């Protein structure tokens, strides 16, 4: 629908870390939405960006991408140290149905919780 | 971890379609894993690939890629019609701890089910 406050739940190993996000509006330079983490001073918070494109002269197929990145600084004011980039991009043809899109979305969402990927993400162990 | 035969249940708009994946080895040419679903011909098989890159001096950063690409066929013999490319790429640093990676992965996984993204992926309506 529109941009409303999103309250994530049970995030992390223990599931005791909860994240609340308030929309920060959509910029008009290139039409990407944005979110932010409530509370803490800006430039020191989680960022979530969602964008939906349209067919172009060069890119006929659709393109929806989600970019998420968050820096964790260390100790007058905290200074950013390093970031953890993470982006997700899809691609659909104009003739594609809703069933296939939903199937891909939920399949990848479930795959991000597999033992294989939980081992391949938290630790750095290549699949072998 | 060994690339065991993963399977997916209660997947879809109504959570009814299920799929089974069998491993198809790992190729040393670029160090990427692979997964696939058993099918009549390789062309129509749903494919899932995961990989992690050694942070060489040219890049000095970690990368994790997950590429999901499944086609569909329509009817002598079926042929591929349209693709459903869907890739996921990560990035980290040498000194990044486990907490940040766990937080990023878990929030991405939980946000994929958030109603905003549910609406965005389905009807492709911009936020």
């Amino acid at each position: 629908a529109k941009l409303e406050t999103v309250t994530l739940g049970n995030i992390g190993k223990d599931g005791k870390q909860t994240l609340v996000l308030n929309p920060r509006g959509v910029n008009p330079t290139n039409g990407v939405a944005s979110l932010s983490q409530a509370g803490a001073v800006p430039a020191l918070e989680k960022r979530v960006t969602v964008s939906v494109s349209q067919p172009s002269r060069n890119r006929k197929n659709y393109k929806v991408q989600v970019k998420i990145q968050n820096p964790t600084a260390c100790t007058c004011d905290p200074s950013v140290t390093r970031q953890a980039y993470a982006d997700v991009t899809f691609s659909f043809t104009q003739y594609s149905t809703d069933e296939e899109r939903a199937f891909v979305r939920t399949e990848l969402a479930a795959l991000l919780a597999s033992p294989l990927l939980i081992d391949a993400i938290d630790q750095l162990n290549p699949a072998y | 971890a060994k690339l065991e035969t993963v399977t997916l249940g209660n997947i879809g708009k109504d959570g009814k379609q299920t799929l089974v994946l069998n491993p198809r080895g790992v190729n040393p040419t670029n160090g990427v894993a692979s997964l696939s679903q058993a099918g009549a011909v390789p062309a129509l098989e749903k494919r899932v690939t995961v990989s992690v890159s050694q942070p060489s001096r040219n890049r000095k950063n970690y990368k994790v890629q997950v590429k999901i690409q499944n086609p569909t066929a329509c009817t002598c013999d079926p042929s591929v019609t349209r693709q459903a490319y869907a890739d996921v790429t990560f990035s980290f640093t040498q000194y990044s701890t486990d907490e940040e990676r766990a937080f990023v992965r878990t929030e991405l996984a939980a946000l994929l089910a958030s109603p905003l993204l549910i609406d965005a992926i389905d009807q492709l309506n911009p936020a």
Epitope: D14, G15, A110, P115 | K2, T5, T7, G9, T18
Partner: antibody, heavy 118, light 103 residues
């Protein structure tokens, strides 16, 4: 789909040393996740000894960790649970379960269950 | 990690009947099973929103922060014995809940 769990588990002294077995009649057992349901005799039930497909990743609750071991083979469609040693507790009839590999939480249709007492 | 439900409710055939469960925490999902008086409990709803796997339409449930509905349809002939509960808090140790009886 007809899960069979017919095994031993007759009453034994508090020393364990017994094995539980399961079998699938027409079910495809090659690529699926299994689990065990410890149902207390009166009302409750708890979760214990769940493994994933491929016999590579296992898990246990933090109550019997390091005391219960699961061995599974793809041949003859069987799985084995090792009952090492009891504490005079857990004298309750057991259930075997089926699950997909990465909705490993929540189980699915399961057959009857056997009993074990100490 | 801790769940509870009201127990021992008697209900004549027809009209409405309901039974809920407590949370005592924040849970992403809240599933439950139906156990026949003999043996072999089955599955139903399993997603707090999806109808069921084998139960024919009548049984339904709705989700919230703590309450989880589990609203039985206007007909409940037989449908006896125990309805359990189960949650998945996105970290391993499963909990389940105490049983309940019907008539």
């Amino acid at each position: 789909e007809v899960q069979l769990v017919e095994s031993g588990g007759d009453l034994v002294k508090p020393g364990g040393s017994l094995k539980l077995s399961c079998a699938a009649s027409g079910f495809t057992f090659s690529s699926y996740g299994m689990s065990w349901v410890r149902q207390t005799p009166d009302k409750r039930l708890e979760w214990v000894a769940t493994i994933s497909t491929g016999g590579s990743y296992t898990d246990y609750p933090d109550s019997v960790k390091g005391r219960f071991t699961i061995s599974r083979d793809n041949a003859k469609n069987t799985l084995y649970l090792q009952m090492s040693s009891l504490k005079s507790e857990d004298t309750a009839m057991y259930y075997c379960g089926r699950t997909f590999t990465v909705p490993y939480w929540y189980f699915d249709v399961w057959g009857t269950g056997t009993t074990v007492t100490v | 990690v801790l769940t509870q439900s009201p127990a021992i409710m008697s209900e004549s055939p027809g009209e409405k009947v309901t039974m809920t469960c407590s949370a005592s925490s924040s849970v992403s999902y809240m599933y439950w099973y139906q156990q026949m008086p003999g043996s072999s409990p089955r599955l139903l709803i399993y997603d707090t929103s999806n109808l069921a796997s084998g139960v024919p339409v009548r049984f339904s449930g709705s989700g919230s922060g703590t309450s989880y509905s589990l609203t039985i349809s206007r007909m409940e002939a037989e449908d006896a014995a125990t309805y359990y509960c189960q949650q998945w808090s996105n970290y391993p140790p499963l909990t389940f809940g105490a049983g309940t009886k019907l008539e």
